[PDB]
């Protein structure tokens, strides 16, 4: 249904029923009633719907975008090149927003899954979130509402200049 | 409504004052305009600064909810003095005394909370002790480093 | 999993069905109130199933079913937290609402708009469940403001009465001031943690949480009616008694406390916020109990009781016992709802009389209401092993043995003694002695809807606290070692309150006429806070609105400095230009001046 | 202090009219003219449970099973607690018991 | 505008109600209600009006000092807990004229009788106005009092909104 | 855009060649059809805007503004046809022609590619609007309202014309797509300060900015209902749309030039909210409520953040439906009691139950009850201004309290309490009036189910 590598889940460890009471478990009978009254009728309706879908199989595709020269290769004021570089940058910006959203979803899922041990047991997810938020902030933060590839490039060059200066004097 | 029955400029002469009182359906002896600063009151009457809550609730008012009669001059701040807003009714305790007790009570409590903060109550016990170097890993400590050991002895 | 999640969602969906049918699809106004009451009772049953699964195995989950909106890196989804706090509060809230709606089928029977009343009660319930199961701050804010607006509509139920409209707007006003703190927390969390989801907030666990937590504290101050934003709660007694019962037990007022419990992973690491909440709760519990000592309106006494109990929960937050604060929410919902319904029973019997000075002699005339009122009073004051004992006594023991503000501890203990005093005040003046009500006796409490609804809450007020404490998992280490005088403090100061209250009450029967002290007037008039603040603040704000903002600036100076001055200058210039004599001699003379100036002054000839 | 004779007469005349008006508010027998045991308590509760519990839970379960839980992280459960001496259903692993306690 | 007697009697009633708010118990209130009546009785025959006004003036100051800060209010009295509670159910009678014909058809007999009341109001209006004209001084009415019907077959002038007013419990 | 411009133009022959008694039926039916086709503009792409030709383009900002504009024309026709009943035929058709011409200018204004084309249509809207106010308003004050409206606009707009012509000389183009790529930074000089002011003041007056807002309470109190609806719903948003576009070429000078206008707006919204608490004219109260709401939009546009631009877009659309609905609600009372005084007719819930429900729903959207798009817009601006400076939460939070008080004060005063005894002509709500209110509130609340379509390009 979804890629487990993209949305990982640790293997699930359920304990076996180990009762130490003679009373019947009300949940067990309710569980059986639910599977009989709710699950079985629901599954039959779905299986009928899946039969109709199997008769009419058709396909859709994930659009693929070829890479084009980015803003750094565009001559000043050459709108024809700047336009394609700008459109590509805007698409990449939307993709990076969703990459951060995937990492945040991993982090939130880990916190709920690990319960009271989440602080120790979600260190890897918190690290990856921390690193990706830093990279995303470096690319896109402070550009303003009228952002562009040109402004993003100006931001990067300022950062590279500072990093060069610090490295040289060090 | 004709222009002669609408509010006008501040009345300068006694004839104007008598005319303004008539327009507002008041006795010339009861009619008093707002002071003629440049604030824009004109000749509109200055009526007692009282809430409509203060009016007699048993009188057969034309507008019972407002306690207003048709044609009587409305207070400039009538909309502030409706029964849902500012009440000026007399109070069983003097206003000035009421402020002293409310402020005094609040000030005393705030003082005593500072005192109780400086001299907290507590029990005669030592600190709670936790194993594994005060739960260094569980509290999120870096696995790759090493905390200085926290050791707890029996007593 | 599949049964747990399905049933938890069917509970919420069941509650919306009577609202949707109001779209006339399958609509039978014959007995809409019974339809709504039946829906609540069924929802209560379905909500017990996932509650049992949590009690058994501790099962919890989060349902993020619908993706609503993505704002760049902030994905907003309809998400439901089905955990400890929601799986225990929902059945308690539904059980209490079940009784309240059954009580209302009797109490509001002659209301021409009874169908709209039950629709509003159900909407009140739905918004609170949205609040309690919300997993993100935006979904929580929906329920937060939802309950606030539903209170406005129910407090102002009798909209022809000016006092009812004033109280309704007062609740909105005080709650909107608290909402400033709520939006402050949302802004801080979005700016600093890039999230409104609880998971991410707790995972990142900021150390510098003073600003967001002060915001949450301010929101709780308004919604739970803590000192400073407190007067609106006693004013909400303008609403029909069923509104007071539901408002004070299992909806609006506990929402402020519930918000602070939901954020205990942050507050439990911030001792500064603990100190503030502790002190805010302590003054609230003491101040409002003091006000209750001298109130004569039965609903107002119970209202001030709720504020005092809410202050106690805020104290419990302050001493870092969030799960005990939650337990008190659950236990308090039973006997406090019962107390309002008992007062509704008396009020109805005495033809809308609400002054306890005009009651009395009802102990034998209303035996069942009497029994429920005594049980509820004992549960409230912490009688051992009734429902209130299983939270209040742990809270007092925890406060006594905690490292805490000493003054706040004393205020809490004294307010506990006052709880016994004002409870005695209701029993003494309402039930004992000789009747003081009018001569045409219409007392009658034999309607089965009245009896059954009170009966269910009576059973809860006896056993609910015991049953809940014995099923919830432990989440702290209770402090069970302490000196005898710290163990029994709650019972001792409560008993002395009863003894002191009885002496005060019996002294009212002596043929001596006493003059009021300043303390008596301070208590009677609620410390003058409503008298001063509700007159001074509206007056100053409303005077500025007209004198300065409207008249001085908009009607005068902003007109004067631009359009009025510009127009004046043009008019004067026009008169200068056009006021000419029409004389050939003068016009041609100005030609001579023009030509001369053109050369001598401006050298146009070069 | 007492009604003047003229006040007495006016109140008497208004009183007659008001009582005639109130008497005129009574509905006649035909108004409004409208245009054209235990077991029966099980039925209403049976049909109500079917249309307000069974049908909604059929819809929700279908919705959750075949749409919500087919997407990542839409329903996330806290993992079950595992105590010493437990057996894992997935693997058959047996968690060892805790050490032997000192006597207390 | 209130005479001296009216002021003294209003103070007596007001003081008894606040006294009853303090006492609560009926036997206790009876005891002090008699003591209070004795104080008013001790000066009942005072003749020097200057002295009597001073007594009333002082009594009002004593009442203000000793009033209950939260006196009992009858539930439907102004400031009471049921005051104005039923105003939202009071609908003016003229609203019925706007009913759809199918709504009126549900109460044929009520609306036949209503049509007779409107006929009575119409036939009587001109005589009502005329009576007020010929009984009002030239300057105008100096009080709000209204007269009764004089001739037989006449109705008291300005009766409609008193007679047809909403019921106190209209639903 | 020709698929919208041409059918809009055809509404004029339709109205003039209709049978005498079918002018309202025909114009209303076909303007609703045009509105239906406007949904085809939702074909928006994540990266590129929808660029039809050398003259017209539509992106996520102009699309919701277009759909609101085309939705309002039929609503305005329904709202107007009662108070125009006694007007003679030719003068009715002229009134409808002015409404159609306003829609024509507006859809071209919101889709013009070139800033000078935008300016001309931006300015053409004055003529039909001024005519509607001064010819079909009821009171003497409409003539003065027309003059204030006219000269406040032109005082700022003529400097804008000079600035735009200067920009085209310097840059070579005013095409907005071109300006996205050829934009250069604005350096500090007194020349650029006045270039900045000329580029922004015309839009500030239309919002209106606090201090330049005096024309607005005049224009509403005097305009007929249809004039009030388009003035509140759309014409104010010309200013917001204007700034959202022109701010592209004013950076980084906006960093500090915004300060005086943020202060006026932040303080202005509290002043104008407080004013609403003491207004005696119901139409004037609703007019002052618009000033307070648009103060947020000005702040949002000026601080230039993705969250503030999304909140500004949602706020403009949400206020359009709410404010227009409130004017329609106030007008329905006016058609019965023929006075705008708020305190004159009270307890109307007793007499008009369903209408009181529309009053409640309009009030709750006005005070931004979550999750209405009113709240979504305001909250996004609150979130972004807090990042601008944390202290703004004090002003924004206080304004939320005041907004609730006056929103519910208006509800309580007119709907609750006791009815006025002598007002006996409150006839039952007509089907036309009820349908008019539902066609405001229903789309407003339906948008809560899919807010992204009204969040603008920054989404
Ligand atoms: C942060 C920024 C804060 C901003 C606050 C805005 C305050 C707005 C001021 C109100 C403006 C007037 C609006 C009109 C409302 C009105 O006039 O109603 C009057 C109403 C009467 O109420 P009542 O006494 O019950 O009389 C009924 C019996 N006839 O009386 C009322 O209901 C109005 C009472 C409200 C008065 C304001 C009280 C503010 C209290 C703040 C101090 C506490 C600080 C926070 C708490 C401490 C935190 C731990
Ligand atoms: C912080 C967030 C706060 C939100 C506030 C806004 C309030 C809005 C009002 C609340 C709405 C509550 C109901 C939520 C579900 C309604 C939407 C829905 O179920 O269908 C959408 C769903 C698509 O799934 P999803 O990826 O999550 O959505 C992406 C596009 N938005 O489509 C599906 O997958 C379901 C399709 C299969 C349904 C089959 C069941 C049929 C049942 C019989 C008909 C009844
Ligand atoms: C368990 C409760 C713990 C908290 C208890 C808090 C109690 C603190 C009370 C502080 C308030 C005292 O406030 C004080 O009251 C007295 C009594 O009138 C006032 O006293 C003054 O006014 C009275 C009456 O006008 C006059 O006799 C005289 O002018 C003067 O005595 C003081 O001007 C005021 O400052
Ligand atoms: C901030 C940028 C925009 C500023 C625009 C300023 C230019 C002027 C705009 C309004 C011009 C309207 O033109 C004229 O104005 C004046 C007041 O201003 C109006 O006059 C009004 O005020 C004057 C003086 O208080 C009164 O004598 C008059 O009775 C009243 O109607 C005229 O009736 C109107 O014909
Ligand atoms: C930012 C630059 C904007 C430039 C815009 C230029 C707009 C010029 C508008 C017309 C100016 C003259 O407009 C004229 O103003 C004067 C006063 O203001 C008005 O005059 C009215 O108010 C004045 C002031 O109390 C009275 O003295 C006068 O008796 C009265 O008639 C005229 O009725 C109006 O016709
Ligand atoms: C060589 C170039 C010439 C180009 C001319 C193109 C258009 C020629 C149109 C000729 C027909 C005009 O029609 C004439 O005007 C109107 C509009 O129809 C008609 O009468 C009108 O009454 C009302 C409007 O008042 C409407 O119902 C409708 O518009 C029409 O019936 C006249 O009864 C008819 O005599
Ligand atoms: C929100 C609802 C709005 C209602 C609007 C009502 C007006 C509807 C206008 C319909 C216009 C259809 O216009 C016409 O549609 C047909 C489909 O049969 C398209 O037909 C074409 O579509 C695409 C084009 O890439 C290709 O599959 C192929 O070339 C062909 O099928 C035409 O490209 C288009 O010219
Ligand atoms: C609602 C009203 C809004 C009003 C807003 C007012 C904003 C005021 C902005 C002030 C900045 C103006 O722009 C500023 O002007 C100064 C001259 O004084 C310019 O100064 C320029 O000439 C001076 C010579 O004196 C040189 O020393 C300097 O090197 C050079 O920059 C700056 O280049 C520019 O930074």
UniProtKB/Swiss-Prot annotation, chain A:
UniProt keyword Mitochondrion, yes or no? yes
Residues annotated as carrying Phosphoserine in the record are 148
Q: Which Pfam families does the record associate with it?
A: NDUFB10
**Domain of life of the organism in this record?**
Eukaryota
The stretch of residues making up the signal peptide is none
Q: Report if keyword Phosphoprotein is assigned.
A: yes
A Gene Ontology cellular component where this protein is annotated is: mitochondrion
Q: Where is the composition biased (Basic and acidic residues)?
A: 1-12
Q: How does it sit in the membrane?
A: Peripheral membrane protein
Question: What family classification does the UniProt entry report for this protein?
Answer: Belongs to the complex I NDUFB10 subunit family.
Task: Read off the PANTHER family from this record.
Answer: NADH DEHYDROGENASE [UBIQUINONE] 1 BETA SUBCOMPLEX SUBUNIT 10, NADH-UBIQUINONE OXIDOREDUCTASE PDSW SUBUNIT
- What is this protein identified as? NADH dehydrogenase [ubiquinone] 1 beta subcomplex subunit 10
Species: Bos taurus (Bovine)
Upper lineage is: Eukaryota, Metazoa, Chordata, Craniata, Vertebrata
From Swiss-Prot, chain B:
Its record classes its membrane topology as: Single-pass membrane protein
Keyword Ubl conjugation assigned to the entry: answer is no
Where is it mainly found? mitochondrion
Q: Which GO terms describe its biological process?
A: mitochondrial electron transport, NADH to ubiquinone
Which residue ranges traverse the bilayer?
Answer: 102-122
Q: According to its record, what are the GO cellular component terms? A: mitochondrial inner membrane; respiratory chain complex I
Sorted alphabetically, which keywords does the UniProt record give?
Answer: Electron transport, Membrane, Mitochondrion, Mitochondrion inner membrane, Respiratory chain, Transit peptide, Transmembrane, Transmembrane helix, Transport
Q: Report the locations given in the UniProt record.
A: Mitochondrion inner membrane
What does the record give as the function of this protein? Accessory subunit of the mitochondrial membrane respiratory chain NADH dehydrogenase (Complex I), that is believed not to be involved in catalysis. Complex I functions in the transfer of electrons from NADH to the respiratory chain. The immediate electron acceptor for the enzyme is believed to be ubiquinone.
Q: Which family, according to the similarity comment?
A: Belongs to the complex I NDUFB8 subunit family.
Provide the assembly information.
Complex I is composed of 45 different subunits.
Q: State the protein's name.
A: NADH dehydrogenase [ubiquinone] 1 beta subcomplex subunit 8, mitochondrial
Species source reads Bos taurus (Bovine)
Q: Which residues of the full protein are shown?
A: 32 to 186 of 186
UniProtKB/Swiss-Prot annotation, chain D:
Q: Does the keyword Signal apply?
A: no
**Ranges annotated as spanning the membrane:** 42-64
**Subcellular location, principal:** mitochondrion
- N6-acetyllysine found at: 23
UniProt topology in membrane: Single-pass membrane protein
Q: In its keyword annotation, does this UniProt entry include Nuclease?
A: no
Q: Subunit comment for this entry? A: Complex I is composed of 45 different subunits.
Q: Tell me, what does this protein do in biology?
A: Accessory subunit of the mitochondrial membrane respiratory chain NADH dehydrogenase (Complex I), that is believed not to be involved in catalysis. Complex I functions in the transfer of electrons from NADH to the respiratory chain. The immediate electron acceptor for the enzyme is believed to be ubiquinone.
**Protein's name in the database:** NADH dehydrogenase [ubiquinone] 1 beta subcomplex subunit 6
Provide the species name: Bos taurus
Biological classification of the source: Eukaryota, Metazoa, Chordata, Craniata, Vertebrata
Q: Which gene encodes it?
A: NDUFB6
Swiss-Prot record, chain E:
- Known InterPro entries for this protein? Complex1_LYR_dom, Complex1_LYR_NDUFB9_LYRM3, NDUFB9
One Gene Ontology cellular component term attached to this UniProt record is: mitochondrion
The cellular location(s) given in this protein's UniProt record come to: Mitochondrion inner membrane
Q: Which one GO biological process term can you cite for this protein?
A: mitochondrial electron transport, NADH to ubiquinone
Q: Which residues carry this modification: Phosphoserine?
A: 77
| Subunit-level organization | Mammalian complex I is composed of 45 different subunits.
Q: What does this protein do?
A: Accessory subunit of the mitochondrial membrane respiratory chain NADH dehydrogenase (Complex I), that is believed to be not involved in catalysis. Complex I functions in the transfer of electrons from NADH to the respiratory chain. The immediate electron acceptor for the enzyme is believed to be ubiquinone.
Q: What is this protein called?
A: NADH dehydrogenase [ubiquinone] 1 beta subcomplex subunit 9
Gene encoding this chain? NDUFB9
